[PDB]
């Protein structure tokens with residue numbers, strides 16, 4: 001009667017769920033666990049050309065309303081994720097996204113040049129992270145529309161495949177417009193993942209009178225409950241403004257209902273970060289059944305039936 | 314014993330609490346209620362030169378985690394708030410801030426010209442709102458650094474008094490820096506209120522499969538629980554970067570503990586929006602009591618003892 005199936009980017013997904021990049025997808029064991037999970041897909045930790053230890057700990061804190069982190073791109077390096085995609089990932093189980101977060105345009109160019117062949121041969125799909133908010137002294141690329149255009153230009157020039165972009169949240173229609181205008185100039189950008197963390201929040205523990213993460217004086221990306229309306233806004237903003245592109249929702253998904261909201265806003269895939277961090281990949285079984293339960297209660301049979309159909313007043 | 318006293322801009326405030334601009338401060342009755350309340354101060358609704366009906370309703374929605382609104386600056390017009398400040402407000406009770414949100418730099422300039430005499434004579438303090446995120450086709454001025462510098466230059470030229478600026482949240486250190494650099498060019502900007510709403514979130518009611526406010530396709534400013542870490546981040550970011558200025562915290566204050574966090578982040582005054590909307594002016598008795606209780610438990614006697622003293626790791 002019902003189906004969470006998603007068909008996009010020449011792939012079939014059992015369901016729209018996947019991990020948010022950076023959550024439970026850094027190590028082989030994590031990637032395998034994500035592959036073995038009920039998720040429709042997975043995306044590997046945002047990689048840099050070489051392994052990165054990331055920021056000093058503590059760099060993640062679970063919170064009643066979500067999470068704050070300043071991980072700082074700890075990752076095994078591009079070769080590692082490329083090898084996973086090329087040699088290890090069971091594409092028979094589900095499609096794979098590889099998140100890339102070069103620290104400069106040059107780094108993204110170099111990795112993309114090498115990713116090209118593996119994408120061709122294996123079908124791994126690039127999610128280009130333009131919104132890492134946690135590397136000290138590195139602005140979120142997509143908050144600088146010139147840096148964003150330049151990065152997309154460079155990747156589009158060297159990378160002979162469609163890819164997606166992991167976007168920071170924007171908070172003004174002027175920015176939705178400006179970002180969408182730029183994204184629409186790149187036909188290879190076939191999906192937009194909205195959103196990365198709400199950047200550089202500051203959690204203060206009233207008990208300790210201190211921040212809760214070490215890097216950057218305690219400023220870190222916010223995820224979880226905090227970010228859901230912002231995520232939905234961005235999902236919908238780009239869903240509307242980039243009609244030639246898919247939107248992947250990310251932000252504040254804890255339940256099938258939250259996922260339902262993402263899809264209603266226009267999400268094709270739904271990424272799960274904080275909730276997954278706290279619950280582990282078993283969450284995908286829960287989220288699939290919950291989303292199905294929501295759809296059953298609402299008498300929806302497929303995601304196509306309500307994707308992007310949020311009613312305005 | 315303990316004091317919530319705040320001293321700034323030649324004024325004594327019984328406590329740091331005040332309404333957030335736009336909340337319960339549009340009408341004479343509201344302004345009188347705010348004045349009669351236990352709040353340390355109050356700010357009048359952001360005004361435009363002439364009255365504004367504001368955006369179509371529904372334009373405010375209380376939420377489990379806060380609020381979303383697209384009020385669209387409904388206000389009685391500058392003359393009205395000017396007259397309140399000039400003729401009606403009992404300054405014997407508490408200092409008064411007047412929030413100004415002209416839709417253009419010229420509108421602000423013209424209002425400031427006329428506000429100048431009332432500020433001189435009565436001591437009303439301008440809070441210049443550069444962060445209205447709800448007027449369709451009008452971007453948040455403070456997201457345009459050139460426009461903000463321009464506006465502050467234009468206002469400073471005609472306004473021979475100290476004033477503050479109501480800021481939107483920023484989400485990247487590069488923007489904290491850029492914004493702080495601009496604000497630091499203006500010695501008359503003696504306070505910075507961080508933050509206005511997290512702009513243009515989108516609340517979707519899963520049950521109705523619809524947005525919850527009418528203007529701008531449901532996109533509206535987020536307040537309340539959603540915004541606290543962002544508010545704290547901005548308060549602290551500007552606290553650090555504008556040591557010559559005071560910071561007024563605004564965002565996510567429901568309790569004395571929240572207020573304590575604002576102050577720890579660097580807030581001198583603490584503004585209360587969503588919580589005040591949802592509880593009314595009696596909230597200030599609660600908040601003062603709670604903040605004193607927090608301070609008592611933490612063995613602080615004055616706000617100066619911990620203002621801005623959030624410990625980093």
Ligand SMILES: Cc1cc2nc3c(=O)[nH]c(=O)nc-3n(C[C@H](O)[C@H](O)[C@H](O)COP(=O)(O)O)c2cc1C
Nearest residue numbers: 020021022046195196197223224251252272273274
């Ligand atoms: C610990 C942690 C690591 C993350 N790493 C990445 C990353 O490497 N690349 C990326 O694009 N986003 C990363 N994110 C952001 C998530 O992908 C996601 O956008 C964000 O957490 C919002 O979703 P959520 O509310 O479900 O947490 C990370 C988030 C967390 C909490």
Ligand SMILES: Cc1cc2nc3c(=O)[nH]c(=O)nc-3n(C[C@H](O)[C@H](O)[C@H](O)COP(=O)(O)O)c2cc1C
Nearest residue numbers: 333334335359508509510536537564565585586587
């Ligand atoms: C109904 C409503 C009206 C508001 N009107 C104004 C306004 O006129 N000027 C302004 O600077 N901020 C206005 N705000 C934003 C608040 O001043 C405050 O920045 C925001 O709500 C965050 O505080 P909170 O979390 O306590 O709600 C308004 C907020 C709400 C909810």
Ligand SMILES: O=C(O)/C=C/C(=O)O
Nearest residue numbers: 071072073131132134
């Ligand atoms: O590794 C991190 O700090 C997170 C990056 C991101 O949110 O893109």
Ligand SMILES: O=C(O)/C=C/C(=O)O
Nearest residue numbers: 383384385386445447
């Ligand atoms: O009147 C409003 O819509 C809100 C204004 C603000 O947040 O500055």
Ligand code: NI
Nearest residue numbers: 171483484488
């Ligand atoms: Ni911004």
